[PDB]
Amino acid sequence: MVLYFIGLGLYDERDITVKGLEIAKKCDYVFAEFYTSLMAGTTLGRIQKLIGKEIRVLSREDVELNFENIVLPLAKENDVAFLTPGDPLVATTHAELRIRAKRAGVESYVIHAPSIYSAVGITGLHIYKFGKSAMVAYPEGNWFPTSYYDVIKENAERGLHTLLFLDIKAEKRMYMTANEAMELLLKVEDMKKGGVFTDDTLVVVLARAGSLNPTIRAGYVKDLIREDFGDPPHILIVPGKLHIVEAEYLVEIAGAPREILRVNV
Amino acid sequence: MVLYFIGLGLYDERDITVKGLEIAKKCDYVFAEFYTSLMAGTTLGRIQKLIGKEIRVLSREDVELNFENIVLPLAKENDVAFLTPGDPLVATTHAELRIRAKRAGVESYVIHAPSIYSAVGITGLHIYKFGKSAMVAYPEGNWFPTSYYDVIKENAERGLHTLLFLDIKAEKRMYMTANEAMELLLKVEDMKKGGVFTDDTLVVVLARAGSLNPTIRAGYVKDLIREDFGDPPHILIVPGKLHIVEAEYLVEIAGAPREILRVNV
């Protein structure tokens, strides 16, 4: 009787750790969710085949309201696994599920996996220099979210980089692109006018991290806002003050304008 | 003609991803480095046996000064792997190595794996709330670095959590403990009197992330400064004001005293 939270990784079924695979392979029951993120390089079948077990997919409602009614009961007499994209506890509310397991008398274990949060390192931006992170949510009705704009502002004042997770509506299959995120930010800039996000703002786009050929691009908003970065998922990053080597990488690897080599210390 | 930056993960030889293991097995040459960090839950022999390839270990100088003389030449006419603990390119100097590869006419690909930056999610702290990260270094001679202290001050000033990497003498396999880190911080507090780190400060200690039996402890400095958190490596975190959900996890999963539910929320 035990519950394993197992991350599947960034892009395909092979992004799971060897540890996670060995353990999943020997679990009696296997559950999973695919609404917290998008694994653009695989399918449920490829995952099932790799693990050699049938996988029951749960919706956000199944988890958020019935985790203790669907999964925990089984973990009382067997070994159960709960799979998720990336790392199980990053930019999700899955950590609270460990409390539910406790209160149900079920020991739980976490098997980590590559997360978009650390894969940002491939942009060449020093990961220790990232500050508060934010999520850009699709506007709904007359409710128009803007908190992520202040996050960028606060970080930028401190010279820190900002990681912006992009919205995802799995059931509708809506995956916010870096372009849509850029458009939303420009609209918030007009509203607040704090000189935080403009056509001249340098940004970095990372698409489909985890694949062997992700899209890594850096440039000014005015030039990237209409560029095609391939299929989702995408993340947007607003760098803070750049180090010479960060800029060198952006130019050499992310194709940024050579003029950013000239940093303003 | 191809260089693969492959991550080994967090603790043992099973923390490498399936994608990384298979790709390393198809490589003609395999290098590794264990100066940026160490795999406390395994050995070079076990990693070697798992990959089924002889592994040549490179020192900090081998990499930083002669990467293009030791690794790249072979990468010109072969598939070469460069293994590193955690997720590739997280260590601040590693990204630049891709520029050297390009400059050498060598194609490079990054194969991700779990990093402590994302793994700390198991502490129950929301990942978006982490601010700038720092490293606590051992003082030596007339040198007593304290900038990591200011990092905590600025993060906590904004309700942000601070991730503190602890010093390590990889060569001498000497791990700074969470306890030593706290003593150092108290000392710095005594010298800067900024009211940033005191006996009443709440902290979180994460030891052996990646293991099935990691140590997750949360509490006040005065009660944890002499507690035994087990074998290294240790990671220290100074949380900013907590979200009730975070506090509940620290209490239920990390054994934090109920006092944080009213004092740190």
Ligand SMILES: Nc1ncnc2c1ncn2[C@@H]1O[C@H](CSCC[C@H](N)C(=O)O)[C@@H](O)[C@H]1O
């Ligand atoms: N491979 C990938 N490439 C680019 N962005 C990604 C990504 N995987 C996740 N994301 C980003 O993160 C959002 C999901 S947030 C959930 C993240 C997950 N637990 C992890 O550890 O990575 C997506 O909407 C997207 O903006």
Ligand code: NA
């Ligand atoms: Na961070």
